[PDB]
Amino acid sequence: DAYAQWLKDGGPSSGRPPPS
């Protein structure tokens, strides 16, 4: 899962677009 990694990196902190 991309969303699992999105949170691990810091979510909003990282600025990377969240996967819908």
Side-chain angles (χ1 to χ4, degrees):
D1 281 58
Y3 210 109
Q5 210 145 105
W6 189 84
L7 294 170
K8 261 74 188 169
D9 287 85
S13 320
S14 326
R16 58 212 279 170
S20 289

